[PDB]
Each structure stands twice: as C-alpha cells, then as structure tokens.
Amino acid sequence: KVQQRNLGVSGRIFTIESTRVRGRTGNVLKLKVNFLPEIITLSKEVRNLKWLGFRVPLAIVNKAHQANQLYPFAISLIESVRTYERTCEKVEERNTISLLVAGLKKEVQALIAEGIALVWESYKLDPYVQRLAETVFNFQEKVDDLLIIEEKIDLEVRSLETCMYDHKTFSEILNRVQKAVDDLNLHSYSNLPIWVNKLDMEIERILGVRMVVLSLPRIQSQRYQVGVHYELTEEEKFYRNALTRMPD
C-alpha cells in the first residue's frame, strides 16, 4: 500500500481545497498545508516497525526520513493554519467586532499570500513559519481580548437601561466603559473611532429612552492622542444632545 501510494513532499507549501458544508449552497474554499497526515502515519509506522525485525524497504525509509526532515516546519504550519481558521470562526461568531480586526486579518492574509508563493525547497521557510506562527498567535490573542472586553461593554450597555437614576452610578458606569474604550485603543485595534461613535449613538439612544443625564460626559474615542491640537465642544463632551433624542 505504501509503495502504491508513493507519498512525497514537494512544491508549494499551501493548497486551496474545496469542502461542501451543509446549509451553504456554495463550496467552501479552505487553505490546507501541503503535508498530508498520511505521511506522518507512514513515518510513524516505519519507525515503529523497525525494531520488531520487520525489514522495511530502503526507499520507504528514505522517504520517511525526507518527510521527518521537514516535519518540524510542517507541524507548525498545520497548527498556525488551524489557529487562523479558529480565529476566523471566532470573528464570524460576533459580527459587531469585524471592523476592529481589519489590520490584523489583512496582515495575516498578506503573510499567507507570501507563503503561498513559497515552496518547501526554498530557504525562506525556516524564519517565515516562525514569523507566521507569531503573527497568528498575536491575532488569536488580540481576538480573544477583543471578545471579552467587548462582551463587558455590551453588558455595561445592557446595565445602563436598568441603571438607577443617580449621577454617581451613571458616572461610574460611563467611566468603566470609557476605560474599556481606552484599553481598546491601547492594543491598537483598527477603526476604533467608527466603533466608538456607533457606541456613542447607541448609548445616546438609551439615554433618550431614559440635567443629570445632560451632565454625563461623553465616551471619548481616542483619549491617548495627546498634543494634537484639537478642541471638542460641550455637545461632544457631554450628552447635552440627549434632549433631542426623545421617542415620545
């Protein structure tokens, strides 16, 4: 069976494959590594059978050695690609955070494209994979953070509808979500002004459903850009416009 298969490793490291998934009419394209698990099983069988007196043919042992040469890069590529796929799935789970991972996903896709042109025989594989792995890990970590704090923001939003009508509670809740937005800014998430002004409209709508409100300071977009000489009016500093957002 092994001689019939005649497995080997060559060519480009990445491949694009079709996979039919129930519920979607279109065939899902996926990025697989050019290293099939059957080669790993072949190497495992070759190295396990040797000590039982089972004389394996020399060509199969040579091919197992060739596969084992590149196995350290292949396993890292496999796990990096799987982590990228799970990161994409996590992003797809929540559609309210897609714009906040534009740069990270773009650079990861750029690295993936750079690696598609790469081949096993090239000498760029050794650093690149490590770089790719690091990038993917950072992406995952970012997305992980981008999930948790965002959920907290949502929780705080849903806590403001039922928030007690007293200035101290409103002030500390808006301070908490402002600190959350500042933390978003610190970790360099793209399109923060878009997401935060959307949150500003949403919380202004909530306050419209709800002087105490008008004295509440607004949620600043980027509280860290200091020294750039720009001014914000009282309307942009507080929810003075909440009087204009009544539903009744």
């Binding site: 480009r12 991972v101 534009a102 598609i116 042109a117």
Partner: protein
Amino acid sequence: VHDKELAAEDEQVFLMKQQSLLAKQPATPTEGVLASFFNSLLSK
C-alpha cells in the same frame, strides 16, 4: 477628516483570489536648480 474604513476581504473571496493568482502565475523553474546656476555662467 474621518479616516477611511479599511477592511480585510472575506476568506472565501480571498482564497478564490489566491487561486486565481496561482493560476495566472506561470509555472516557474525551481538638481535642475543647481544646474541652472551652472548653465548661466557658461553663457556669460
């Protein structure tokens, strides 16, 4: 001026795009201002 909304492409369209570029990829084997002063002196 509010920044343009940058966004990465979809994974499906991105992979289709990468396949298209792989197909299209053939199988490979494996000063004047300084001069202006100089021009004037030569004429004089």
